[PDB]
Design a protein around this ligand. Structure first.
Ligand code: 9A8
Ligand code: ZN
Length: 209
């Protein structure tokens, strides 16, 4: 029951999502190995993901978390990159979309930095890059990221150089960077119902001039 609605580039909603995508690019400690070498994107399309059942699944869980946390869902908008983007938008997040080997355990991982999520669009470590050219830094092939509504609730703070259950008494984990002063936070949820894939963003990475 998913439909995708194209946003016009003239729409304020398109512009605000594009700005979050572009403004949260950073350099990565791998020199571009996983996600490619780029400072910005060419945004090709932004689509709203509409699914009544998945939205109601999300809001139901959000209310449960809010009620366990002094009426505070602690809702964020965060990026997610995955080879399973097309499954996620149709069936929702679940255990199959977890990063089993993630540093905060087997859960579903999200980033404040769009460029962090870009490292996972072709798999863990960028896999073998794009299917057409086998290039993790492909400037031709179209990539997709999700910009997701995520319920964190009470989040367990992990200081770090950067499914399972949430730590007891918590609804998520926050990976705070403790080495790279430019990195933004990363977050992990352990219930697929705590995220909704609100925007599907189609883009290319751009070769630096
Ligand atoms: C089958 C593999 C690719 O499952 C994964 C799917 C998504 C991710 C993923 N991990 C992240 C870790 C930190 C910050 C962001 C992400 C992310 O966007 N996706 C990891 C594994
Ligand atoms: Zn390619």
């Amino acid at each position: 029951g998913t439909i995708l609605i194209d946003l016009s580039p003239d729409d304020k909603e398109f512009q605000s999502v594009e700005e979050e995508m572009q403004s949260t690019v950073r350099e990565h400690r791998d020199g571009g190995h996983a996600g490619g070498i780029f400072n910005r994107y060419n945004i090709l399309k932004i689509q709203k993901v509409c699914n009544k059942k998945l939205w109601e699944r999300y809001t139901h869980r959000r209310k449960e978390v809010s009620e366990e946390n002094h009426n505070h869902a602690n809702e964020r908008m965060l990026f997610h990159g995955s080879p399973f983007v097309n499954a996620i938008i149709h069936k929702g997040f679940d255990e199959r979309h977890a990063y089993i080997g993630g540093m905060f355990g087997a859960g579903i991982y999200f980033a404040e930095n769009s460029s962090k999520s870009n490292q996972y669009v072709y798999g863990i470590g960028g896999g073998t890059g794009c299917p057409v050219h086998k290039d993790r830094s492909c400037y031709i092939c179209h990539r997709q990221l999700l910009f997701c509504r995520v319920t964190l609730g009470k989040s367990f703070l992990q200081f770090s150089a950067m499914m399972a259950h949430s730590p007891p008494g918590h609804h998520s984990v926050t990976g705070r960077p403790s080495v790279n002063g430019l990195a933004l936070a990363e977050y992990v949820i352990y219930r697929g119902e705590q995220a909704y894939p609100e925007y599907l963003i189609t883009y290319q990475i751009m070769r630096p001039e």
